[PDB]
Design a protein around this ligand. Structure first.
Ligand SMILES: O=C(O)C1=C[C@H](O)[C@@H](OS(=O)(=O)O)[C@H](O[C@H]2[C@H](O)[C@@H](NS(=O)(=O)O)[C@@H](O[C@H]3[C@H](O)[C@@H](OS(=O)(=O)O)[C@H](O[C@H]4[C@H](O)[C@@H](NS(=O)(=O)O)[C@@H](O)O[C@@H]4COS(=O)(=O)O)O[C@H]3C(=O)O)O[C@@H]2COS(=O)(=O)O)O1
Ligand SMILES: *[C@@H]1O[C@H](CO[C@@H]2O[C@@H](C)[C@@H](O)[C@@H](O)[C@@H]2O)[C@@H](O[C@@H]2O[C@H](CO)[C@@H](O)[C@H](O)[C@H]2NC(C)=O)[C@H](O)[C@H]1NC(C)=O
Ligand SMILES: *[C@@H]1O[C@H](CO[C@@H]2O[C@@H](C)[C@@H](O)[C@@H](O)[C@@H]2O)[C@@H](O[C@@H]2O[C@H](CO)[C@@H](O)[C@H](O)[C@H]2NC(C)=O)[C@H](O)[C@H]1NC(C)=O
Lengths: 200, 200
């Protein structure tokens, strides 16, 4: 009969030393191959699970491969590294190609594009503490910590869309050691603590 | 009132370069400290989240710490590393200690304690292919592959509890290149393919 793809391979990230696993499943197919950016993935790397659907009697083949950082780096198309699945069978059936799955190397650099700095400032002063994550993929999420406690926005302190922390009228209770943390699936990094003194 | 623990710190593994995060949550408490293998965790390392449930009006404190491979290795109790959290508060309230969480370093060695070997054997022979994972913590899980297809136990081939593959009466169709794969949270390893020839 006709070959169609049941599970489509999904884009995703290679994180640290953990390959990205693509899974691809096709009904009425006998062979699945993976081609990634003009190169063919060596068929010995493909882990196949073959059977017949008990309910409908329709055969299937479920193939998965681990795409590694070695693969992406040796491709020649690192910034457009993308993979596809090919379901063939009898001499009479048409090869059916899958969706394109893109594989990216997830990372987070070491240097914060914006980081706070120590301040000694008088009570009532509006103080703004900047923070912007290091260049990262996927995008990072910021959390702010005051002496180890996650800062909770209220009436005087607010988290601004640019990632900074704003205290409208600095209370004495706002003094402390502040740190910004950036997090994504690849790493989690904190600025060195800066000190904030509020006096009168 | 009364201090009680909502989230108990849970045992677990340090995997690769990923610390284990112990989390500990207490009602009506104001401070949580962590002690690990008799040593006290420096309170600047504790990520604390403080608030009031509002639904129940009952205050809480949710504290977390990342236990690293460096922590376990410099402890002096590498094979018995265990941690606890202590939720204090007012000078009037009793310190409440939590469950003991043990931290282990997850690993899996390089060579299999048992691996198959090539066989050329006559049809009808009972054939047994051994496999035992490399020494690993936590315990590893075995998968068998025939030329890349996951072996499905049936009537002639059966997965035995000792990890081996047993073919009661070797059929011609049982010839192929066989591989044993071991998996645990720390790594995944495959024996080199061996060939099994079944003749007449
Ligand atoms: O040029 C480089 O420096 C570099 C190049 C690589 O591109 C890079 O990959 S990336 O994915 O990170 O972008 C690579 O990072 C390595 C790093 O070099 C390793 N160092 S090593 O162990 O000496 O070899 C390593 O270390 C990190 C671990 O996540 C972790 O170690 S442990 O828990 O396994 O013992 C440790 O974690 C810190 C954590 O980062 C802290 N976060 S904070 O925001 O900074 O506060 C905090 O939670 O404490 C823990 C524990 O601290 S302790 O160890 O002092 O107790 O340290 C990390 C580190 O290196 O600083 O792994 C990364 C990732 O490698 S991977 O191959 O991609 O997996 O560096
Ligand atoms: C905020 O931080 C200051 C100083 O931080 C210290 O130095 C850093 C490099 C880091 O190693 C931190 O963990 C240190 O705490 C704190 O002032 C220190 O307080 C301790 C005891 O309270 C004292 O022994 C040190 O000498 C002090 N250091 C200095 C430079 O004065 C301060 O207590 C922290 N908390 C608040 C709310 O400001
Ligand atoms: C079992 O394997 C042999 C050899 O496996 C080859 O070497 C491995 C290291 C790995 O890279 C495999 O992918 C290789 O196939 C097979 O013998 C080969 O058969 C093909 C038939 O298409 C032939 O083109 C090769 O030249 C042969 N190579 C050698 C060294 O003999 C054998 O066919 C496999 N048996 C089964 C049932 O799959």
């Amino acid at each position: 009969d006709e070959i169609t793809i049941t599970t489509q391979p999904k884009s995703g990230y290679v994180i640290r030393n953990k390959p990205l696993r693509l899974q691809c499943r096709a009904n009425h197919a006998t062979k699945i191959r993976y081609k990634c950016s003009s190169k063919w993935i060596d068929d010995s790397r493909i882990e196949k699970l073959i059977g017949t659907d008990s309910t409908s009697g329709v055969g299937y083949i479920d193939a998965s491969v681990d795409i590694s950082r070695i693969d992406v780096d040796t491709s020649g198309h690192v910034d457009a590294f993308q993979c596809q699945c090919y379901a063939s069978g009898d001499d009479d059936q048409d090869v059916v190609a899958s969706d394109v799955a893109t594989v990216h190397l997830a990372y987070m650099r070491k240097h914060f594009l914006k980081s706070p700095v120590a301040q000694r400032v008088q009570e009532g002063t509006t103080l703004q503490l900047p923070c912007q994550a290091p260049e990262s993929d996927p995008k990072a999420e910021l959390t702010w910590y005051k002496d180890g406690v996650v800062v909770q926005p209220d009436a005087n302190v607010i988290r601004a869309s640019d990632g900074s922390l704003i205290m409208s009228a600095a209370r004495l209770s706002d003094s402390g050691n502040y740190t910004c943390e950036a997090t994504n699936v690849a790493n989690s990094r904190k600025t060195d603590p800066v000190e904030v003194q509020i006096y009168h």
